[PDB]
Structure 1
Amino acid sequence: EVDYNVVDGVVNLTGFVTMVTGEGLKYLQNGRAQFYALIVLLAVLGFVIFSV
C-alpha cells in the first residue's frame, strides 16, 4: 500500500497538477478584445520598468 499510494500517487499527482494548471489557466483567455487591449500594452511596460 506504501507502493500504490505513497509512491504512485506522488507522480500521478504530477499529471494532476499539470492537468489542473491547464484547466485553470485557460480562463486567462476569456473572449474579450478589451482584455487583450489590456494585456497587450500592459503586457509590456513592465518590460520597460526592469530595462532602463
Structure 2
Amino acid sequence: EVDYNVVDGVVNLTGFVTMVTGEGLKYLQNGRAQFYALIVLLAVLGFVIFSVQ
C-alpha cells in the first residue's frame, strides 16, 4: 500500500477535484436570470479590457 497510495492519492486528488469542481461550478447556475444578465454583461465589460490591453 505504499507506491499505489501515492498514485491513488492522485485518484483521491484528481478523481475528486473534478467532481467537486462540477459540484462547485454547479452553483454558478442558481436561477434568477438577472444574475445571468450580470455574467453576460460582465463578459462584455471583461472582453473589451481583454482586447485593448
TM range (shorter): 0.7 to 0.9
- Residues of 2 paired with 1:37 and 1:10: CA distance? 38
Structure 1: gaps (5+ residues):
none
Cα RMSD for the two superposed structures? 1.5
Size of the aligned set, in residue pairs, is 52
Q: Which moved more, 1:35-44 or 1:5-14?
A: 5-14
Q: CA deviation digits over 1:21-48, x for unaligned, max 9?
A: 0011110000011001111111221111
Deviation of 1:12 (Å): 3.8
Deviation of 1:8 (Å): 1.8
- Structure 1 segments, 4+ long, off by >6 Å, are none
Higher helix share: 2
Identical residues among aligned pairs (%): 100
- Residues of 1 paired with 2:36 and 2:44: CA distance? 12
